[PDB]
Amino acid sequence: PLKVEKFATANRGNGLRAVTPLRPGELLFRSDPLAYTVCKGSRGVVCDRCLLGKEKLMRCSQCRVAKYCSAKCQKKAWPDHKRECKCLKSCKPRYPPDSVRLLGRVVFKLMDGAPSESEKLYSFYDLESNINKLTEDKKEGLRQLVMTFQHFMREEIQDASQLPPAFDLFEAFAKVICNSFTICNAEMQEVGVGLYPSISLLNHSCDPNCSIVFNGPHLLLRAVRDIEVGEELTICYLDMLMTSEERRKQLRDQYCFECDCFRCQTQDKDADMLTGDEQVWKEVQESLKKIEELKAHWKWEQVLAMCQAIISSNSERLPDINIYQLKVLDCAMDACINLGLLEEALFYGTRTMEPYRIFFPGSHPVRGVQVMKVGKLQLHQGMFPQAMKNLRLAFDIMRVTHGREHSLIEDLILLLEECDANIRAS
Ligand SMILES: CN(C)CCCN(CC[C@H](N)C(=O)O)C[C@H]1O[C@@H](n2cnc3c(N)ncnc32)[C@H](O)[C@@H]1O
Ligand SMILES: [Mg+2]
Ligand SMILES: [Mg+2]
Ligand SMILES: [Zn+2]
Ligand SMILES: [Zn+2]
Ligand SMILES: [Zn+2]
């Protein structure tokens, strides 16, 4: 009962295509990960199982590394965590890279696990390594991860016979880097990384016809536009606010390919993204490196301090459509929400609305969540008609990008019903 199938593309390798016409919002695939792990920055912040930020987490007794929101989450996570727990324990104080911890879970899943439904269309052994396209610097980085893995796993795995029969650690890491999915929360922090081999069949487009959304570790693949029978299915591997030059570099470095898509050919939106004095937004772009690092580690007061020094800077300022200014406004909004400043969060969030409409496609999950947060801030500050307009716009987007299978849609429906009741009382 699949609406999608694997096929061999001409120049792109393997891909995924529709066997039947698809309509916007239609659910193509849903899977749990083959393996996944919390990211280094969100470790000890978000529950290891459900990846939700909780006010109270508790450490696993043995390793004291994994943290859980509930006994339910540690029990559900115990099969995945059982063997790595002894590895994390023995390697303290040192914490392995995310890719190393992710591959360790892959190895344990393949060794001790039943066949994973995540592999239905495509398996881990099928994944693209792009090894013959790797530069010598990339290969050396992989060699370092191999030795890190051999150190990190030395407790559980001392020899190749404990690895799967065909398993080559160099090839395995090459596969992990190109096939890893980043799991993000509503604040654009990356809370986790996981492998979904069936979903790895989707080739990239900067103008994709599909989108992925995450509910905890659970992934949902949906069509965001009408798709003809036989048409290849694509997602965007990258953040939507990047210049064609930035996208080219990232797609080269990580995925070893050159994007020929129409947006990259025409440098679509590049000029509008870079508006303002070039010297000014180079300095903002440099500051974003530190700001987004603080955000990855969930230090909001420090994020807001740096963001205000930009938005409010005595020195020259940039238009809100400048993508680096826009990223700063977004980080400030998310800091104000966590720090409990709603008026200021709404001020920043309101300023991101029109730029988000321009830069994000018609239905994109990032924009849907952004509009939902703004409408939610407006509702709680008691602007009902403004909140209702944005909550309805968020629903128009998120019914396509998220769908009834996503828990956030249920929350949005409750916000709409509350906002509507307030308007009718007036
Ligand atoms: C988490 N997710 C993002 C993983 C993607 C794994 N693959 C896709 C499936 C591949 N075709 C396969 O056979 O397994 C990427 C790889 O696919 C190629 N690829 C893609 N999109 C191109 C595109 N638009 N143009 C050219 N090559 C593309 C590229 O080599 C690139 O590393
Ligand atoms: Mg190849
Ligand atoms: Mg946001
Ligand atoms: Zn949990
Ligand atoms: Zn443990
Ligand atoms: Zn492109």
Swiss-Prot record:
Protein's UniProt name: Histone-lysine N-methyltransferase SMYD3
Sites where the protein binds Zn(2+) 2: 60, 63, 81, 85
UniProt xrefs under InterPro entries: H3K4_H4K5_MeTrfase, Hist-Lys_N-MeTrfase_SMYD3, SET_dom, SET_dom_sf, SMYD3_SET, TPR-like_helical_dom_sf, Znf_MYND
Subcellular location: Cytoplasm; Nucleus
Pfam family for this entry, one: zf-MYND
Domain SET: 2-238
EC number: 2.1.1.354
Subunit structure: Interacts with HSPCA. Interacts with HELZ. Interacts with POLR2A; the interaction may be indirect and may be mediated by HELZ. Interacts with HSP90AA1; this interaction enhances SMYD3 histone-lysine N-methyltransferase.
Binding residue positions for Zn(2+) 1: 47, 50, 69, 73
Organism of derivation: Homo sapiens (Human)
Catalytic activity: L-lysyl(4)-[histone H3] + 3 S-adenosyl-L-methionine = N(6),N(6),N(6)-trimethyl-L-lysyl(4)-[histone H3] + 3 S-adenosyl-L-homocysteine + 3 H(+)
